[PDB]
């Protein structure tokens, strides 16, 4: 029931995408400004009253601008691909880094010296205001030590929004924003005067009208653009064009979309103005060729909608999803490489009555990614046994080019895993991808799916150290290292170490929860998730139907290999001793006095020759399980302040790098301040049987208690998907993984001399694309140790 | 017990008299205190910032041992002045800089340096305070209601809200000392996981700051004491210093270990309670059960004589008068005097149901006898076990003319708090909050006295079909010369009551939200159950008991109106109701033809020749039953944001005099802008028929679902309490009274020329007090107003 054929890329992609490239990103001051502005003029009043009336006046006042042949329009920079910035969340770290910003070596951004000036000057009102400062002062001390040693990093909500959401696009599509008000004036009704709630939740639904009011102003002001730009332009058709963007803009998203164009359109301004209203990254389209069918479907059999122009939109809306940046502090930026804001878009799966739901748009958002082969967005596939193998070849196909994309999940177990967390069969059906890897059922959760990373390392470096880091006490004393006894006295040793240092990181995210909630209510992005309008509450103080916090842990494979050797060489052959084995951790092998040095080769040498994770050894296998059960079954046990459970999720994004810069040699033989892995798979150069035999091993985790998401990457050589009978033997692999209840896969598709390459020659791969995890980024944008990172990592 | 009254020291008539040497002044000290903490303690969470303010003024604020002073503890540095409270509001008072010292209700001296010192400091507070969050809160009916005088809730919204009794036996028998280990205790139940570990710890953090800082505060005066005994050349002040410097070195930081460190310890607490917030009816309450056994323990160790132990007492009243607050002009004739309300009870019944009265009980009553002064608002509980030769005692204190004590029923009283949640237990031990509110201690948080209510005012929108000065201000419920029967103007008058009850509950909501999120208080809430186990202040919901107590006025009025428009205009034909309408708009013609205005005259002598409330006449008393019930039962069904119910008070403090003045002419005969009446009582001068016939009318409303506490107020002439055959038939009188379950009596003991000499010579007549309601005051301090309006009272 669609048509699988691809269908052909308009001239005008290319220059909109060359476009956005012509410059350097660039930081931008006039949302400071502006809501410094309107704070200031809105004190005494209360706080989601004052977010709503400065998301007023900043949409207001924003300098907007169309891009050259943009069909899509909504820009939130004059410069492309440039950022605003949000100093209600943190901004000393931006003034920091002034004079270093623009040649920095991971996300540089160019900042002009009047911007600067602007920005001292607005950032000023912030001081003592930011949700950074309250969310310090609601850490406790022990806290704020295992940040210090880097157990955990809470950084992400701490310096910026949350986001991490699937709003209600569909319900803005079919009602219109128009509807939405109707809907919020309809609950008023509900309100007396004396109700005990009457002052709080009247205030947060007039905060929603003024919000919803903010955006259909914002797109009335590009209509009124539109209208002036087609005056003055001598292309006939282009001067069409802008006719068509003013009269769509006129009714989107104030009113119900009436065609294709406007859906997009529609989509996009939502999609745009949550990234205004707050810095939040994740802002995840989710089921876009879902909710947009009804809307292409009517168009096209009315005869005034072409498959061609179809394909052109979404290529439109492809690249605008890039123009859209985040500036995040330098050391931040290297957990976030790529200038990603991984906004999740998946396409397939089942519909709410369990039949394949492929369509149309499943197809075309898979060559949107080919024509405009960009980072963003992040497309996913959802898979289950009654998938179209139409769109998995489709998809294959797509993956064969090297861009990284799209990311396959498996129904089979994200399904249930949602049901045992709260969802309804009928909700977990409807699920899609947040960000990397995080299922969520879409506008219902306030999901806080990367809410900070975990070293699971730093707890077992612990260990030995008996809980002291750089001469200082960092941690518990689980007790002398060579005076355990056995293996499982270690082992527990262990888990009390991740136990301690688990509950603080759950302070940490609690913390900077209660500073969302009390500082930055967020009345748009509230009004398009239930249930915030019925309870009058926004999704910062538990409006939400489902609550979750979504902290990763890293390093599973380094872990279990590393009590693996414990284990093996140090308490049943005995062909090392404990004191030894410390000594060399603390030497780094002897990698940087030659008996020693020799001797601790030695010791590395005959540790690299144990059996790895990632090759299908049981006994090897069965400690990486167990220790992925040290981290997901302890936080599955804790609640957050908007009344939610954690859930563990295991996925790197690219801090898996600069968290092993933060971790000395470990027993697995990976050597100091060296990248831990990436998500759930094996150690790099480790798994060395194939990709059958990777997906055995990892397949022996327990993902579905990860409810928050794993992340399996994989790197194919090109040849292996030659020809149809390569796109079917790589579905082949998917598929045994999958069955086996695994939740995720991803793939670089890549040859090793293109990359060095690349290194050597950047000007010459300039559109070079490759998958880091959970994303894809432009090779050359990365810096040197992500690039090694991604380069050594095992070729199939 | 000995009830002997004990002699008086000649100290006491010296300090009364330095009290008074000089006009109340304004301080500026702590709002500059207040300011410089809260502008350096900006992004903590407010309790932490509240807890250090507390902290920072207790330690800066200058203290001063005033001559001859056994107990020591000032606010101020000159006697009765105040300091100012910004965080609530201040606009009003830097409006009133110039008039202030002149204005006609409880003037204040302000000096030029203070004017610039709080014009510095309040600059900060623009925006911050709860009076402006508050008014955010408000819905635009509501602003319209207060803005046409239906009711104010200026109190909680100018300043603090205080009326509380808390644990000082708590303080007494384990100290700060023991409560800090209180709440150390508790931060052993809370793990850094808990989803309310941030708010839970800083909340007890919090309070462990605000007890070290009462704790400072003690000792900086026992430091001072002993600078001073160095220079003190009197051997025998030079002693009562070094004593008072032991003892504030010992209290209220532990246990107190005799009775004048109680005396201390009580006195600090109730200081410093008045410093962290500028809430009144800081409520001594149960002072004689809880102070006696520190007495009685001092007393047989032969350590203490009876003397010392009544010097003591006297000692402390004349304290409770050294503290004072500044209102707003309007305000201030609401709460005219100069009054703090601290209400201190003797007698009753202990928790397992016997007489409770003991030496202390003697001894408060006869510490009003010997100073003299308004405060503390001597109670006394009646029931039927009362010790007769207390309540003789209590009769003699009421025929000095002093006003006190104020009887309370406990047969009505602890059925009534039973009703409303109290266990038995906890309802036998009330006290009295402020003027009549009666509360269980040290257990609720019961927001007594929060808003004026004018029943009045809805019975003049009946006429008027729901207009005031041509402009709308509240519902239509008809045409009143369409009414065709007495039911449908009293389903009428019920209906406008509804209607604007209702905004008054949204107006406190919004003040309740405002205080929870501007101003919780640590240090009031520790002192209180059950906040240290709950985590959270009694602003916030902390307390095991919440309530909202709003008081409604002109019940006597409202009664006799309808009675007026039930007979003449219904039931007897004898005026149209349209001429009735006429009569009021024109004020009985009392300031047109003289035709009409003796007619409007005619009309008036008729209404006044009717039967009144008072009087024992059943007709006229059922419908101000029935009346009384518009109000009260109604205001029993709403909620507010602590998670208590509404309960309604029928008290007049000194407002019905400025209410009255903002009220047209009514039925009842009243004249326009005259004052409303007093309490539940009659009329002046409507109750004709003697005092047992007075209590007999107005023992007929419901006093139980007025849970919030009523006042009767009634006047004799000395030589009807002359002899002791006065006495007793004036405690059969009130138990005449209660034992129709009446609530409260509380008496004027004057012959109406002493006050009238006192209006025309005040300088002979400094010393006069008399009762107000609920409170009493220097006659003198009054304004001519309200000296008229208790001049003008029925005397017996």
Known sequence: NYDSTPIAKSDRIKRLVDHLYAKMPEIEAARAELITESFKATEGQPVV?????????????????????????????????????????????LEAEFETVETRSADPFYISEETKKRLLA??????????????????????LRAMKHNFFTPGNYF???????????????????????????????????????????????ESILISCDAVIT?????????????????????????????????????????????????????????????????????????????????????????????????????????????CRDAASAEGFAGYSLFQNLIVGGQTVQGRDATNDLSFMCITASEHVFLPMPS????????????????????????????????????????????????????????????????????????????????????????????????????????????????????????????????????????????????????????????????????????????????????????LYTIKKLVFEEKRITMGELKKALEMNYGKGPEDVRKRYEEIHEMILELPKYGNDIDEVDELAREAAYFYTRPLETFKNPRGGMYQAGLYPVSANVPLGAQTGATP????????????????????????????????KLDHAIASNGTLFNMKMHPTAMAGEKGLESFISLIRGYFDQQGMHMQFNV??????????????????????????????TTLSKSLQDDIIKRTEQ
């Open 159 to 205: 310096y910026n929004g949350v986001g991490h959401v699937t709003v209600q696009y569909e319900t803005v599509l079919a009602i219109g924003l128009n509807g939405v008000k109707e809907k919020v004036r309809k609950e008023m009704e509900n309100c007396h005067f004396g109700d005990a709630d009457y002052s709080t939740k009247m205030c947060f639904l």
């Open 122 to 143: 607005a950032d000023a009102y912030w001081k003592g205001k930011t949700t950074s400062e309250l969310a310090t002062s609601y850490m406790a001390p022990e806290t």
């Open 49 to 93: 009253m004052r977010k709503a009336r400065a998301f007023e006046h900043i949409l207001k006042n924003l300098p907007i601008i169309i891009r050259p042949e943009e069909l899509i329009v909504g820009s939130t920079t004059i410069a492309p691909r440039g950022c605003q910035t949000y100093p209600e969340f943190s901004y000393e770290w």
């Open 750 to 779: 890549v040859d090793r001399a293109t990359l060095l390459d690349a290194q050597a020659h950047p000007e010459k791969y300039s559109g070079l694309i490759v998958r880091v995890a959970g994303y894809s980024a432009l090779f």
């Open 379 to 562: 497309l996913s596939i959802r898979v289950w046994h009654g998938s179209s193998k139409a769109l998995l070849m489709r998809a294959a196909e797509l993956t064969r080019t090297g861009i990284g994309l799209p990311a396959y999940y498996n129904d089979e177990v994200i399904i249930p895993a949602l049901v045992h967390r709260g969802a309804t069969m009928d909700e977990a059906r409807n699920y899609n991808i947040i960000g990397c890897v995080e299922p969520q059922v879409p506008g219902k959760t306030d999901g806080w799916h990367d809410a900070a990373f975990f070293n699971m390392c730093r707890p077992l470096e612990m260990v030995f150290s008996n809980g002291y880091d750089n001469g200082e006490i960092a941690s518990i004393q689980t007790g002398n290292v060579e005076s355990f006894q056995s293996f499982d006295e270690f082992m527990e040793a262990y888990r009390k170490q991740m136990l301690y240092n688990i509950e603080l990181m759950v302070n940490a995210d609690n913390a900077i929860d209660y500073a969302h909630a009390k500082l930055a209510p967020l009345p748009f992005e509230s009004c398009l998730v239930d249930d915030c309008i019925k309870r009058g509450m926004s999704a910062q103080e538990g409006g939400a139907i489902y609550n979750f916090t979504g902290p990763q842990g890293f390093g599973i494979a380094n872990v279990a290999d590393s």
């Open 218 to 326: 914002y797109a009335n002001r590009y209509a009124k653009m539109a209208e002036e730009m087609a005056e003055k332009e001598t292309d006939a058709a282009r001067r069409q064009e802008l006719l068509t963007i003013a009269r769509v803009c006129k009714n989107v998203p104030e009113f119900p979309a009436e065609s294709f164009q406007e859906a997009c359109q529609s989509f996009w301004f939502i999609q745009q103005v949550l990234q205004i209203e707050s810095s939040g990254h994740s802002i995840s389209p989710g089921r876009f060729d879902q909710y947009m069918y009804p809307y292409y479907e009517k168009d096209l059999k009315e005869g005034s909608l072409t498959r061609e122009y179809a394909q052109e939109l979404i290529d439109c809306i492809w690249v605008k999803l890039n123009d859209l940046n985040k």
């Open 668 to 699: 697995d033989g990976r050597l100091a301040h060296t990248p831990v892995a990436d998500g759930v798979g094996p150690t790099s150069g480790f798994d060395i049987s194939g990709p059958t035999a990777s997906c055995n091993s990892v397949a």
